[PDB]
Paper text:
To help unravel this photoconversion sequence, we produced a construction of the GAF domain from TePixJ, hereafter called TePixJ(GAF), that enabled production of crystals that retain reversible photoconversion between Pb and Pg as well as thermal reversion from Pg back to Pb. From large-scale crystallization trials of Pb in darkness, we identified conditions at pH 5.5 that would generate yellow rod-shaped crystals. Remarkably, upon irradiation with blue light at room temperature, the crystal color transitioned to magenta, which returned to yellow/brown in darkness, revealing the presence of a photochromic bilin. In an effort to generate a crystal structure of TePixJ(GAF) as Pb with minimal X-ray–induced damage, we used continuous vector translation across the length of the crystals to lessen X-ray dose. The asymmetric unit was occupied by 2 TePixJ(GAF) molecules (designated units A and B), which dimerized in crystallo via a 4-helix bundle involving the α1- and α5-helices. Additionally, the electron density for both PVB moieties and the adjoining thioether linkages were well-resolved and continuous. Superposition of the 2 molecules in the asymmetric unit showed that the main-chain atoms were highly similar throughout (root-mean-square deviation [rmsd] of 0.47 Å for all Cα-atoms) with some differences noticeable at helix α4, which appeared to subtly alter the atomic positions of the adjacent PVB moieties within their binding pockets. As in previous structures, the B-ring propionate of unit A formed hydrogen bonds with H498 and W499. However, this contact was altered in unit B. Although the hydrogen bond with W499 was retained, H498 was displaced by R507′ from unit A in the symmetry-related molecule, which formed a salt bridge with the B-ring propionate of unit B.
Author numbering: 435 to 584
Write the structure that this text describes.
């Protein structure tokens, strides 16, 4: 079924993603029609909370960024505590443990399905060009598989 096929692909993407970046967490964050995200798959290193199966409503995507991410926007943040974020934003990440993050889009049938997100949990991390390119290509490849499989 479509549901069973998707999950296996999500698991591949998060496993490969964390291997490529050797970071603390990679997730697939999938949007519903409210642009509320669910963590549908996760690969996480020892000692960190499991973000799997969390529903996280963050209005900034629908209110500002969905079309930009469809067009290939990313977020690369070396230190989330120096990114001028509000407490609301910091509060949603604190249960997970995020000190640096890399967010790339998953676009299927010209719509923003979700985001493929990498975390470093306890130290800043400048994401390098080759890492961003690798991770962006992973998410784009996985998205295109999903787009073509059914
Ligand atoms: C936009 C915004 N949110 C996120 C969210 C995440 N980062 C992650 O690692 C994860 C998975 C755990 C999530 C989810 C990102 C990356 C961005 C930036 C998008 C960009 O510019 O590309 C954002 N959301 C908030 C939350 C805040 N705003 C509200 O209205 C309410 C309510 C909030 C608390 C829930 C903030 C402050 C931003 C940044 C400013 C903006 O884009 O509006
Ligand atoms: Cl969903
Ligand atoms: Cl938009
Ligand atoms: Cl744009
Ligand atoms: Cl482009
Ligand atoms: Cl088909
Ligand atoms: Mg199709």
């Amino acid at each position: 079924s479509e549901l069973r096929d998707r999950q296996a692909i999500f698991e591949t993407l998060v496993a490969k993603g964390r291997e490529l970046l050797a970071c603390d967490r990679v997730i697939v964050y999938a949007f519903d029609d409210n642009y509320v995200g669910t963590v549908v798959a996760e690969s996480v290193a020892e000692g960190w909370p499991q973000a799997r199966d969390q529903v996280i409503e963050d209005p900034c995507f629908r209110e500002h960024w969905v079309e930009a991410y469809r067009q290939g926007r990313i977020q690369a943040t070396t230190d989330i505590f120096k990114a001028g974020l509000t407490e609301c934003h910091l509060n949603q990440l604190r249960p997970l443990k995020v000190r640096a993050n890399l967010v790339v889009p998953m676009v299927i049938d010209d719509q923003l399905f979700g985001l493929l997100i990498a975390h470093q949990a306890s130290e800043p991390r400048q994401w390098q060009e080759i890492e961003i390119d690798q991770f962006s290509e992973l998410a784009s490849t996985g998205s295109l598989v999903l787009e073509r499989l059914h």
